[PDB]
Write a protein that binds this DNA or RNA. Structure first.
Ligand SMILES: [Mg+2]
Ligand SMILES: [Mg+2]
Ligand SMILES: [Mg+2]
Ligand SMILES: [Mg+2]
Ligand SMILES: [Mg+2]
Ligand SMILES: [Mg+2]
Ligand SMILES: [Mg+2]
Ligand SMILES: [Mg+2]
Ligand SMILES: [Mg+2]
Ligand SMILES: [Mg+2]
Ligand SMILES: [Mg+2]
Ligand SMILES: [Mg+2]
Ligand SMILES: [Mg+2]
Ligand SMILES: [Mg+2]
Ligand SMILES: [Mg+2]
Ligand SMILES: [Mg+2]
Ligand SMILES: [Mg+2]
Ligand SMILES: [Mg+2]
Ligand SMILES: [Mg+2]
Ligand SMILES: [Mg+2]
Ligand SMILES: [Mg+2]
Ligand SMILES: [Mg+2]
Ligand SMILES: [Mg+2]
Ligand SMILES: [Mg+2]
Ligand SMILES: [Mg+2]
Ligand SMILES: [Mg+2]
Ligand SMILES: [Mg+2]
Ligand SMILES: [Mg+2]
Ligand SMILES: [Mg+2]
Ligand SMILES: [Mg+2]
Ligand SMILES: [Mg+2]
Ligand SMILES: [Mg+2]
Ligand SMILES: [Mg+2]
Ligand SMILES: [Mg+2]
Ligand SMILES: [Mg+2]
Ligand SMILES: [Mg+2]
Ligand SMILES: [Mg+2]
Ligand SMILES: [Mg+2]
Ligand SMILES: [Mg+2]
Ligand SMILES: [Mg+2]
Ligand SMILES: [Mg+2]
Ligand SMILES: [Mg+2]
Ligand SMILES: [Mg+2]
Ligand SMILES: [Mg+2]
Ligand SMILES: [Mg+2]
Ligand SMILES: [Mg+2]
Ligand SMILES: [Mg+2]
Ligand SMILES: [Mg+2]
Ligand SMILES: [Mg+2]
Ligand SMILES: [Mg+2]
Ligand SMILES: [Mg+2]
Ligand SMILES: [Mg+2]
Ligand SMILES: [Mg+2]
Ligand SMILES: [Mg+2]
Ligand SMILES: [Mg+2]
Ligand SMILES: [Mg+2]
Ligand SMILES: [Mg+2]
Ligand SMILES: [Mg+2]
Ligand SMILES: [Mg+2]
Ligand SMILES: [Mg+2]
Ligand SMILES: [Mg+2]
Ligand SMILES: [Mg+2]
Ligand SMILES: [Mg+2]
Ligand SMILES: [Mg+2]
Ligand SMILES: [Mg+2]
Ligand SMILES: [Mg+2]
Ligand SMILES: [Mg+2]
Ligand SMILES: [Mg+2]
Ligand SMILES: [Mg+2]
Ligand SMILES: [Mg+2]
Ligand SMILES: [Mg+2]
Ligand SMILES: [Mg+2]
Ligand SMILES: [Mg+2]
Ligand SMILES: [Mg+2]
Ligand SMILES: [Mg+2]
Ligand SMILES: [Mg+2]
Ligand SMILES: [Mg+2]
Ligand SMILES: [Mg+2]
Ligand SMILES: [Mg+2]
Ligand SMILES: [Mg+2]
Ligand SMILES: [Mg+2]
Ligand SMILES: [Mg+2]
Ligand SMILES: [Mg+2]
Ligand SMILES: [Mg+2]
Ligand SMILES: [Mg+2]
Ligand SMILES: [Mg+2]
Ligand SMILES: [Mg+2]
Ligand SMILES: [Mg+2]
Ligand SMILES: [Mg+2]
Ligand SMILES: [Mg+2]
Ligand SMILES: [Mg+2]
Ligand SMILES: [Mg+2]
Ligand SMILES: [Mg+2]
Ligand SMILES: [Mg+2]
Ligand SMILES: [Mg+2]
Ligand SMILES: [Mg+2]
Ligand SMILES: [Mg+2]
Ligand SMILES: [Mg+2]
Ligand SMILES: [Mg+2]
Ligand SMILES: [Mg+2]
Ligand SMILES: [Mg+2]
Ligand SMILES: [Mg+2]
Ligand SMILES: [Mg+2]
Ligand SMILES: [Mg+2]
Ligand SMILES: [Mg+2]
Ligand SMILES: [Mg+2]
Ligand SMILES: [Mg+2]
Ligand SMILES: [Mg+2]
Ligand SMILES: [Mg+2]
Ligand SMILES: [Mg+2]
Ligand SMILES: [Mg+2]
Ligand SMILES: [Mg+2]
Ligand SMILES: [Mg+2]
Ligand SMILES: [Mg+2]
Ligand SMILES: [Mg+2]
Ligand SMILES: [Mg+2]
Ligand SMILES: [Mg+2]
Ligand SMILES: [Mg+2]
Ligand SMILES: [Mg+2]
Ligand SMILES: [Mg+2]
Ligand SMILES: [Mg+2]
Ligand SMILES: [Mg+2]
Ligand SMILES: [Mg+2]
Ligand SMILES: [Mg+2]
Ligand SMILES: [Mg+2]
Ligand SMILES: [Mg+2]
Ligand SMILES: [Mg+2]
Ligand SMILES: [Mg+2]
Ligand SMILES: [Mg+2]
Ligand SMILES: [Mg+2]
Ligand SMILES: [Mg+2]
Ligand SMILES: [Mg+2]
Ligand SMILES: [Mg+2]
Ligand SMILES: [Mg+2]
Ligand SMILES: [Mg+2]
Ligand SMILES: [Mg+2]
Ligand SMILES: [Mg+2]
Ligand SMILES: [Mg+2]
Ligand SMILES: [Mg+2]
Ligand SMILES: [Mg+2]
Ligand SMILES: [Mg+2]
Ligand SMILES: [Mg+2]
Ligand SMILES: [Mg+2]
Ligand SMILES: [Mg+2]
Ligand SMILES: [Mg+2]
Ligand SMILES: [Mg+2]
Ligand SMILES: [Mg+2]
Ligand SMILES: [Mg+2]
Ligand SMILES: [Mg+2]
Ligand SMILES: [Mg+2]
Ligand SMILES: [Mg+2]
Ligand SMILES: [Mg+2]
Ligand SMILES: [Mg+2]
Ligand SMILES: [Mg+2]
Ligand SMILES: [Mg+2]
Ligand SMILES: [Mg+2]
Ligand SMILES: [Mg+2]
Ligand SMILES: [Mg+2]
Ligand SMILES: [Mg+2]
Ligand SMILES: [Mg+2]
Ligand SMILES: [Mg+2]
Ligand SMILES: [Mg+2]
Ligand SMILES: [Mg+2]
Ligand SMILES: [Mg+2]
Ligand SMILES: [Mg+2]
Ligand SMILES: [Mg+2]
Ligand SMILES: [Mg+2]
Ligand SMILES: [Mg+2]
Ligand SMILES: [Mg+2]
Ligand SMILES: [Mg+2]
Ligand SMILES: [Mg+2]
Ligand SMILES: [Mg+2]
Ligand SMILES: [Mg+2]
Ligand SMILES: [Mg+2]
Ligand SMILES: [Mg+2]
Ligand SMILES: [Mg+2]
Ligand SMILES: [Mg+2]
Ligand SMILES: [Mg+2]
Ligand SMILES: [Mg+2]
Ligand SMILES: [Mg+2]
Ligand SMILES: [Mg+2]
Ligand SMILES: [Mg+2]
Ligand SMILES: [Mg+2]
Ligand SMILES: [Mg+2]
Ligand SMILES: [Mg+2]
Ligand SMILES: [Mg+2]
Ligand SMILES: [Mg+2]
Ligand SMILES: [Mg+2]
Ligand SMILES: [Mg+2]
Ligand SMILES: [Mg+2]
Ligand SMILES: [Mg+2]
Ligand SMILES: [Mg+2]
Ligand SMILES: [Mg+2]
Ligand SMILES: [Mg+2]
Ligand SMILES: [Mg+2]
Ligand SMILES: [Mg+2]
Ligand SMILES: [Mg+2]
Ligand SMILES: [Mg+2]
Ligand SMILES: [Mg+2]
Ligand SMILES: [Mg+2]
Ligand SMILES: [Mg+2]
Ligand SMILES: [Mg+2]
Ligand SMILES: [Mg+2]
Ligand SMILES: [Mg+2]
Ligand SMILES: [Mg+2]
Ligand SMILES: [Mg+2]
Ligand SMILES: [Mg+2]
Ligand SMILES: [Mg+2]
Ligand SMILES: [Mg+2]
Ligand SMILES: [Mg+2]
Ligand SMILES: [Mg+2]
Ligand SMILES: [Mg+2]
Ligand SMILES: [Mg+2]
Ligand SMILES: [Mg+2]
Ligand SMILES: [Mg+2]
Ligand SMILES: [Mg+2]
Ligand SMILES: [Mg+2]
Ligand SMILES: [Mg+2]
Ligand SMILES: [Mg+2]
Ligand SMILES: [Mg+2]
Ligand SMILES: [Mg+2]
Ligand SMILES: [Mg+2]
Ligand SMILES: [Mg+2]
Ligand SMILES: [Mg+2]
Ligand SMILES: [Mg+2]
Ligand SMILES: [Mg+2]
Ligand SMILES: [Mg+2]
Ligand SMILES: [Mg+2]
Ligand SMILES: [Mg+2]
Ligand SMILES: [Mg+2]
Ligand SMILES: [Mg+2]
Ligand SMILES: [Mg+2]
Ligand SMILES: [Mg+2]
Ligand SMILES: [Mg+2]
Ligand SMILES: [Mg+2]
Ligand SMILES: [Mg+2]
Ligand SMILES: [Mg+2]
Ligand SMILES: [Mg+2]
Ligand SMILES: [Mg+2]
Ligand SMILES: [Mg+2]
Ligand SMILES: [Mg+2]
Ligand SMILES: [Mg+2]
Ligand SMILES: [Mg+2]
Ligand SMILES: [Mg+2]
Ligand SMILES: [Mg+2]
Ligand SMILES: [Mg+2]
Ligand SMILES: [Mg+2]
Ligand SMILES: [Mg+2]
Ligand SMILES: [Mg+2]
Ligand SMILES: [Mg+2]
Ligand SMILES: [Mg+2]
Ligand SMILES: [Mg+2]
Ligand SMILES: [Mg+2]
Ligand SMILES: [Mg+2]
Ligand SMILES: [Zn+2]
Lengths: 107, 64, 149, 100
RNA sequence: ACCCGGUGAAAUUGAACUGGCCGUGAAGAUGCGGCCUACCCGUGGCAGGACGAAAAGACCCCGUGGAGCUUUACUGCAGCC
RNA sequence: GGAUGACCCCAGGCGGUAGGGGAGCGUUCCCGAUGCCGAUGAAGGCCGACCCGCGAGGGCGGCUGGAGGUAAGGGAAGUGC
RNA sequence: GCUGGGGCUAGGAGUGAAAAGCUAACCGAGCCCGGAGAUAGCUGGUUCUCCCCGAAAUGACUUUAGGGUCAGCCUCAGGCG
RNA sequence: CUGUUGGGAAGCAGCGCCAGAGAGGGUGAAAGCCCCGUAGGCGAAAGGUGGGGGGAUAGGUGAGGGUACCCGAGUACCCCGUGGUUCGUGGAGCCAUGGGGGAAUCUGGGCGGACCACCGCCUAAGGCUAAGUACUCCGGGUGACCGAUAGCGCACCAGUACCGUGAGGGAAAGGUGAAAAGAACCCCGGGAGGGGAGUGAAAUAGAGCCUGAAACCGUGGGCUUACAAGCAGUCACGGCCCCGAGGGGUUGUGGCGUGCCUAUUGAAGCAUGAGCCGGCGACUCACGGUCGUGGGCGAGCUUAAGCCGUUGAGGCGGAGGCGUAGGGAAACCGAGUCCGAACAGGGCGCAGCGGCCGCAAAGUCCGCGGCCGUGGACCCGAAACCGGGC
RNA sequence: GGGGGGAACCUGGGGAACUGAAACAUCUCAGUACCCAGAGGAGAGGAAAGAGAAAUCGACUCCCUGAGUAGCGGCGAGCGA
RNA sequence: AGAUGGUAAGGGCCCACGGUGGAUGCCUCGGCACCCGAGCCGAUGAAGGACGUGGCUACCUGCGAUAAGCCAGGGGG
């Protein structure tokens, strides 16, 4: 019915695996069809660009490459640790994500 | 499917206790007027079929 | 005793015969069928238990004998099974048809007839029939023949 | 005869163990785990645990070295697959009735 | 048709380093024996051989194979009496 | 001989179509396996004048390959051109 | 007489100035799908290895004769000796 | 969680933790604890279902005695022709009915295998009726199921392209990489293509993309060959080249030497088949039978359908089957029986080892193997025959 | 209210042949293939003018068994309650 | 007089590297079997289609001149 995403634009994530294991950053974008996220300044790649109006002088640009969403973990804004998410039902009762290490909301 | 008893053999033949096959002597159905009494009398007995012929008839009687 | 130890006894599981698989096996090419003719063909011969190449068969030249029966079929009549004295040896006290069925000696649907192989034992034996010598041996051993009807 | 021989085989090895009850095991893995350690089952040897106590089967089932069964289910492949046989007396009771 | 530039099939093909004679051989041999002859590789041509190619001979026989047709063959049916 | 299919010794048999029988090899899959081998490199491919086996085969090494494979003992077949 | 267009007649049926002609490039019974894996006592083909043994091409009968049944001859297991 | 190798950790190492969850799939490789899940729980305003629970309604319910009114008609019944049944004209009943004839209302009628009697069974000629049963377009679960020549005809835009007037026939065709980072820019070229540069762990992973066999085509090198006779090899020796009392490659001379398969009395055969290579390609399965064999039990052995349980757990179930007695067409008798006058003769039948204990066995059940029967029954092949359509 | 559709399944109305019988006609294949009508989530059948020997049972359907029995059968091949 | 080597137009064997080609292994969006579930639609016009429908649209999917969609309830975040 919908792809499940534990992370979203733009909470703060630890990149927990791959060349950039350890980095922290904001999620610029979430791509559910690919099950991927863009994290700011993580997975940079060099891309060739043709001499074009969009890019006179041509040469190359840097692009951020998507990461498999499973490589990424939200950092709790209360306790500051990378966490799994739990859901908690409020009194509304809307439901929310909460850090699983302490109890804080993650938004 | 299961084998069928051959009814023509069931009607001509009997398997004895030890598995020989037994049948009536042939040759007094008719044309008997000039047959001696020794002949008619002896054709009145049962006989034990030759082994190869009996073994064949036996397989036609799987449930006797 | 563990799973890796579980084995069939020698000979308990034999290999099948595979034909038409190469010369070394000694069953290649013709697959043990020989050359040509009906028996080598898929489908093979006629029923070898009966057929004899076109001549009147061994079986069919022998005379039929006796009552073969007519529609509407077998005529319902009481059927008797005999069980000898020796088979009664194991019981003590009484024997009746029902008992003998249980012990696996008398088949259901058959009336009981006692027969004379063996020695009689002084029991009360209840049954639909007795042979002459069964009656004698039983009467003599002090047993009690009771006739059902 | 097969059932009986299989149990017999573990018996002859010392690997068959009968127990009266299961201490504190009330459906939690760590509970069975404790009891097990105390019962001589460190999990270095695989165990076919046979008992009618559902609470005990749930507690043990997830352990990689444990196969669980109700006593009505005792069968020779499972006995032969495992290194040690552990039974309730109530279990041992039905097995005795089945091999009778 | 031939030669040069351009494009470029085919059936067939166990593999082949594939001569002649007299013999031999399942009775018509490049392939076996003995001899004779013969440097290596093509191009245009000829058709004697490769029992050349094509088509599991159509004649012939065989199969308790098939089909069309016939009749005072057998058996039945329509139709008609 | 020794006790038992442990291996030694003496002797004899061992051409083979149809065909009978015996013993094995390898392929796919299952139990073994929540195990074990594996990026310090799976399967598969290409080499080898090496090792074991009568053989079918199995090892071992080098190169390729880049993610699988699967023992001892058993089980079952879409099993060998 | 020839010809355009529009129609009708078909499978043991049509149609035929008759050739068993034609009925969609093979008509002594069209084509498609189905019974269907018809049947083929005929031809072809039948796939790893090693070891032991090892035939027959006769007789009788056979709508049989290049097909079968029995016997003979091969082979295995048990018994006798 | 950390460290470590690595492009990447989930690998290895250190120290931990969860488990009613260690099914399984992903994530840069091999992860219980990262993701999706899993065990265990929860959930519908609306539509559908509702065979379960509750309620209503329709509908249901007496005994003697008398009367002899009613109780399914072109029907029963008989005959003729047929079909159905195991029943093919048979001693042929029963059920059904095309033709003819043609009743009765229980003191009526049909049936129990021609018919008759007796003794029983049952109520024709009006209708309805859940469930237990069949199937699988559809959804889900699961495989000692396939893995792109397989598996559906189709993994892909396939009942498509294409073929046929039409009915109808009917394909081929999957895979870069972890990520497009899918190669800016320069150089040669009209372009295609390439060479650099760049990306990537890897680019003979560059899109004509994983692996990348074989036939087939080529470049380079070693050895060899233009007086030689050939199923192409083999044995010997010698020369040259290579790797280092040896091996490998090559082949001058000498010796020997009639392809494979098939079919045949007999083939190198001038008899069949094959251009070469890769892939597909033929003795099986079920049920019965017969022998053999590995076990279990043994005068006994064994369960089927089902039911309970499980959710890759087994149990129950004795109806039934085989065996325990044969002989006889049968009545029937029975260790005998049949033929016969026979107490004659004959046919076909009947009769463990050790020390009460063990041991073996009849037999029977299951497994395995050979062969047999029924199926298309080892695979491929007709000409034909039949049905329905075009 | 009907009409038309639906992969199999179902009932009813019609209904082959190859083949087997080692020829073939009765017989088999088979009331199968197939055409048609109709139903439905099932359909059919169903509450004895039954069975058939038990002094018995008690609608129908469906499975196991009875049983390859009883029988049927150019008493053949086979068919089969 | 005698005798013995370097020729290779081309060919043959071997070795290396390629080209062609698409086997094999691994892979799986798909298939297959069994079991369970579930089982009618249509004149209120079905099944199945034609033609349309996007700012730019060949095809597929979706949809019907209200045309990749309109209204409302529920779910979800
Ligand atoms: Mg959610
Ligand atoms: Mg770090
Ligand atoms: Mg909400
Ligand atoms: Mg007969
Ligand atoms: Mg006579
Ligand atoms: Mg006569
Ligand atoms: Mg007479
Ligand atoms: Mg007479
Ligand atoms: Mg005289
Ligand atoms: Mg006289
Ligand atoms: Mg007389
Ligand atoms: Mg029987
Ligand atoms: Mg008997
Ligand atoms: Mg086997
Ligand atoms: Mg072989
Ligand atoms: Mg053999
Ligand atoms: Mg042989
Ligand atoms: Mg051959
Ligand atoms: Mg043979
Ligand atoms: Mg044979
Ligand atoms: Mg042959
Ligand atoms: Mg022969
Ligand atoms: Mg042959
Ligand atoms: Mg022949
Ligand atoms: Mg033969
Ligand atoms: Mg053959
Ligand atoms: Mg043949
Ligand atoms: Mg055939
Ligand atoms: Mg045949
Ligand atoms: Mg009889
Ligand atoms: Mg007394
Ligand atoms: Mg466990
Ligand atoms: Mg285990
Ligand atoms: Mg010139
Ligand atoms: Mg030219
Ligand atoms: Mg050559
Ligand atoms: Mg020459
Ligand atoms: Mg001559
Ligand atoms: Mg010649
Ligand atoms: Mg000559
Ligand atoms: Mg010559
Ligand atoms: Mg030669
Ligand atoms: Mg010559
Ligand atoms: Mg010569
Ligand atoms: Mg000459
Ligand atoms: Mg020339
Ligand atoms: Mg010429
Ligand atoms: Mg010419
Ligand atoms: Mg020639
Ligand atoms: Mg010529
Ligand atoms: Mg010619
Ligand atoms: Mg030719
Ligand atoms: Mg031909
Ligand atoms: Mg010919
Ligand atoms: Mg000919
Ligand atoms: Mg002629
Ligand atoms: Mg001739
Ligand atoms: Mg002829
Ligand atoms: Mg004839
Ligand atoms: Mg003939
Ligand atoms: Mg003929
Ligand atoms: Mg004819
Ligand atoms: Mg007229
Ligand atoms: Mg030999
Ligand atoms: Mg042997
Ligand atoms: Mg063998
Ligand atoms: Mg091995
Ligand atoms: Mg193999
Ligand atoms: Mg093997
Ligand atoms: Mg499998
Ligand atoms: Mg596993
Ligand atoms: Mg594994
Ligand atoms: Mg390791
Ligand atoms: Mg690495
Ligand atoms: Mg390596
Ligand atoms: Mg492998
Ligand atoms: Mg594999
Ligand atoms: Mg090797
Ligand atoms: Mg390798
Ligand atoms: Mg994997
Ligand atoms: Mg394995
Ligand atoms: Mg194994
Ligand atoms: Mg096993
Ligand atoms: Mg095969
Ligand atoms: Mg005109
Ligand atoms: Mg005109
Ligand atoms: Mg016209
Ligand atoms: Mg006209
Ligand atoms: Mg006309
Ligand atoms: Mg017409
Ligand atoms: Mg027409
Ligand atoms: Mg016709
Ligand atoms: Mg006509
Ligand atoms: Mg004309
Ligand atoms: Mg046409
Ligand atoms: Mg035509
Ligand atoms: Mg024409
Ligand atoms: Mg013509
Ligand atoms: Mg014709
Ligand atoms: Mg015709
Ligand atoms: Mg059709
Ligand atoms: Mg047929
Ligand atoms: Mg067939
Ligand atoms: Mg024929
Ligand atoms: Mg023929
Ligand atoms: Mg074969
Ligand atoms: Mg010999
Ligand atoms: Mg002869
Ligand atoms: Mg004879
Ligand atoms: Mg004759
Ligand atoms: Mg004759
Ligand atoms: Mg012959
Ligand atoms: Mg013949
Ligand atoms: Mg013989
Ligand atoms: Mg002899
Ligand atoms: Mg013999
Ligand atoms: Mg012997
Ligand atoms: Mg590092
Ligand atoms: Mg780590
Ligand atoms: Mg660790
Ligand atoms: Mg689990
Ligand atoms: Mg797992
Ligand atoms: Mg996993
Ligand atoms: Mg691991
Ligand atoms: Mg693994
Ligand atoms: Mg995991
Ligand atoms: Mg649940
Ligand atoms: Mg759940
Ligand atoms: Mg009254
Ligand atoms: Mg009245
Ligand atoms: Mg009435
Ligand atoms: Mg009326
Ligand atoms: Mg009548
Ligand atoms: Mg009839
Ligand atoms: Mg009759
Ligand atoms: Mg009748
Ligand atoms: Mg009538
Ligand atoms: Mg009356
Ligand atoms: Mg009356
Ligand atoms: Mg009546
Ligand atoms: Mg009547
Ligand atoms: Mg009557
Ligand atoms: Mg009756
Ligand atoms: Mg009645
Ligand atoms: Mg009705
Ligand atoms: Mg109900
Ligand atoms: Mg029903
Ligand atoms: Mg179902
Ligand atoms: Mg499904
Ligand atoms: Mg797979
Ligand atoms: Mg493919
Ligand atoms: Mg395919
Ligand atoms: Mg492939
Ligand atoms: Mg599909
Ligand atoms: Mg295909
Ligand atoms: Mg395809
Ligand atoms: Mg297409
Ligand atoms: Mg056409
Ligand atoms: Mg067209
Ligand atoms: Mg066609
Ligand atoms: Mg094709
Ligand atoms: Mg990829
Ligand atoms: Mg990809
Ligand atoms: Mg990677
Ligand atoms: Mg330019
Ligand atoms: Mg370019
Ligand atoms: Mg360039
Ligand atoms: Mg470039
Ligand atoms: Mg780089
Ligand atoms: Mg690396
Ligand atoms: Mg490479
Ligand atoms: Mg690559
Ligand atoms: Mg390619
Ligand atoms: Mg890959
Ligand atoms: Mg490639
Ligand atoms: Mg390539
Ligand atoms: Mg190559
Ligand atoms: Mg060269
Ligand atoms: Mg000279
Ligand atoms: Mg020279
Ligand atoms: Mg030589
Ligand atoms: Mg020498
Ligand atoms: Mg050398
Ligand atoms: Mg040399
Ligand atoms: Mg020679
Ligand atoms: Mg030669
Ligand atoms: Mg020769
Ligand atoms: Mg060969
Ligand atoms: Mg050939
Ligand atoms: Mg020939
Ligand atoms: Mg010939
Ligand atoms: Mg000849
Ligand atoms: Mg030759
Ligand atoms: Mg030649
Ligand atoms: Mg010829
Ligand atoms: Mg030739
Ligand atoms: Mg020929
Ligand atoms: Mg060709
Ligand atoms: Mg070639
Ligand atoms: Mg090949
Ligand atoms: Mg076989
Ligand atoms: Mg067997
Ligand atoms: Mg057995
Ligand atoms: Mg047992
Ligand atoms: Mg039986
Ligand atoms: Mg006597
Ligand atoms: Mg015993
Ligand atoms: Mg036994
Ligand atoms: Mg046999
Ligand atoms: Mg069949
Ligand atoms: Mg077959
Ligand atoms: Mg067969
Ligand atoms: Mg055919
Ligand atoms: Mg024709
Ligand atoms: Mg005809
Ligand atoms: Mg005709
Ligand atoms: Mg027709
Ligand atoms: Mg027609
Ligand atoms: Mg209608
Ligand atoms: Mg309808
Ligand atoms: Mg009907
Ligand atoms: Mg009608
Ligand atoms: Mg009909
Ligand atoms: Mg007709
Ligand atoms: Mg016929
Ligand atoms: Mg047929
Ligand atoms: Mg037959
Ligand atoms: Mg026939
Ligand atoms: Mg025939
Ligand atoms: Mg004929
Ligand atoms: Mg016929
Ligand atoms: Mg047939
Ligand atoms: Mg019929
Ligand atoms: Mg019908
Ligand atoms: Mg059908
Ligand atoms: Mg309808
Ligand atoms: Mg239902
Ligand atoms: Mg109903
Ligand atoms: Mg109804
Ligand atoms: Mg009523
Ligand atoms: Mg019976
Ligand atoms: Mg019939
Ligand atoms: Mg020179
Ligand atoms: Mg040269
Ligand atoms: Mg040159
Ligand atoms: Mg050469
Ligand atoms: Mg290459
Ligand atoms: Mg695999
Ligand atoms: Mg539906
Ligand atoms: Mg529509
Ligand atoms: Mg559209
Ligand atoms: Mg809106
Ligand atoms: Mg809404
Ligand atoms: Mg809403
Ligand atoms: Zn926190």
């Amino acid at each position: 019915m919908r792809v499940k995403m534990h992370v979203k634009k733009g909470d703060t994530v630890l990149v927990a695996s791959g060349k950039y294991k350890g980095r922290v950053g904001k999620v610029k974008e979430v791509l559910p069809k690919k099950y991927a996220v863009i994290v700011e300044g993580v997975n940079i790649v060099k891309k060739a660009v043709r001499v074009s109006p969009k890019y006179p002088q041509g040469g190359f640009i840097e692009k951020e490459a998507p990461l498999h969403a499973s490589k990424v973990r939200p950092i709790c804004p209360a306790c500051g640790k990378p966490t799994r998410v739990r859901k908690k039902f409020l009194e509304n009762g809307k439901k929310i994500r909460v850090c699983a290490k302490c109890g804080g909301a993650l938004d | 499917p299961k084998m069928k008893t051959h009814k023509g053999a069931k009607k001509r033949v009997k398997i004895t206790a030890s598995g020989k096959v037994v049948a009536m002597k042939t040759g007094k159905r008719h044309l008997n007027w000039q047959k001696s009494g020794k002949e008619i009398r002896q054709k009145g007995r049962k006989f034990v079929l030759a082994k190869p012929e009996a073994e064949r008839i036996k397989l036609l009687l799987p449930y006797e | 005793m563990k799973l890796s130890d579980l084995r069939p006894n020698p000979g308990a599981n034999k290999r099948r015969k595979r034909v038409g698989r190469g010369p070394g096996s000694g069953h290649g090419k013709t697959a043990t069928r020989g050359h040509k003719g009906q028996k080598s063909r898929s489908g093979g011969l006629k029923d070898p238990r009966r057929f004899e190449g076109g001549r009147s068969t061994t079986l069919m030249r022998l005379p039929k004998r006796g009552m073969q029966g007519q529609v509407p079929g077998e005529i319902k009549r009481p059927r008797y099974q005999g069980v000898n004295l020796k088979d009664l040896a194991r019981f003590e006290g009484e024997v009746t048809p029902e008992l003998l069925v249980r012990a696996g000696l008398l088949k259901k649907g058959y009336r009981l007839k006692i027969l004379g192989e063996g020695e009689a034992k002084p029991l009360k034996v209840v049954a639909h029939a007795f042979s002459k010598s069964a009656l004698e041996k039983l009467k003599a051993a002090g047993g009690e023949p009771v006739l059902l009807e | 005869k097969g059932l009986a021989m299989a149990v017999a085989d573990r018996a002859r090895e010392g690997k068959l163990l009968l127990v009266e009850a299961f201490a504190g095991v009330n459906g939690k893995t760590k509970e069975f785990l404790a009891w097990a350690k105390e019962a001589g089952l460190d999990g270095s040897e695989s165990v076919l645990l046979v008992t009618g106590n559902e609470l005990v089967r749930r507690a043990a089932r997830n352990l990689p070295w444990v196969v669980t069964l109700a006593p009505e289910g005792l069968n020779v492949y499972d006995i032969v697959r495992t290194e040690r046989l552990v039974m309730d007396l109530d279990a041992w009771e039905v097995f005795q009735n089945r091999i009778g």
